[PDB]
Amino acid sequence: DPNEIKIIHLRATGGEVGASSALAPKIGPLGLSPKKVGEDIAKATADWKGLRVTVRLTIQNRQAQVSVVPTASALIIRALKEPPRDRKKEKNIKHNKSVSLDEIIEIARTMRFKSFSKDLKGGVKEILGTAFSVGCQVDGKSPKAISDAIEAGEI
């Protein structure tokens, strides 16, 4: 009746995976699972979505482990950026993440599907649209103006 030892852990604060070893002795000690397996699993999961931690969730399954992604709107907005983030430059201005605000971001918002009520996606789409206030949407248009000016369709 081990029940696979359901344990949930979070891995973030990084860029483009990295395959870092250990760094989670507390996670490893719980469930008698090898930390290297979880680190390798998390690195593989984050390899697909580079330059964005996306808050990977690690689930302990007996001696094995499982990887899960959050599909966060902010993580997707981080992915929708200007090209890739080169190394040896993250200490400098990392503002080079400006992309167009269009239906691609609108569809990417549908992953949440209004988890916190939001009265369906009517307020969820506008809220996820306004989430990209750092890049100010595309050109002179702004996420604040896009969300405030209610003229587009609901979906």
Name 99's Cβ contacts closer than 8 Å, sequence gap at least 6. Answer: 80, 81, 82, 135, 138
Strand order in the sheet with 56-61: 7-11, 56-61, 64-68
Residue of 116, 140, 150, 153 that binds RNA (CB under 7 A): 116
100 or 133: CB nearest RNA: 133
Least distance (Å) between residue 122 CB and RNA: 8
Using alpha carbons, select from 67, 65, 69 the residue that is nearest to residue 31: 65
Using alpha carbons, select from 36, 43, 51, 41 the residue that is nearest to residue 17: 43
Residue of 1, 103, 119, 151 that binds RNA (CB under 7 A): 119
- Tell me the C-alpha distance between 8 and 98, whole Å: 33
Least distance (Å) between residue 83 CB and RNA: 11
Question: Interface residues for RNA in 53-72 (CB under 7 A)?
Answer: none
| Type of residue at 58 | T
Residue of 43, 49, 56, 78 that binds RNA (CB under 7 A): 78
Residue of 1, 3, 26, 83 that binds RNA (CB under 7 A): 26
Query: Is residue 131 close enough to count as binding RNA by CB under 7 A?
Result: yes
Other CB atoms within a 10 A radius of the CB of residue 134 amount to 12
For residue 57, what are the β-bridge partners?
10, 68
Chain contacts with RNA (rule: CB under 7 A): 10, 12-15, 23, 26, 51-52, 74, 78, 81, 85, 90-91, 94-95, 97, 116-119, 123, 126-127, 130-131, 133-134, 144, 147
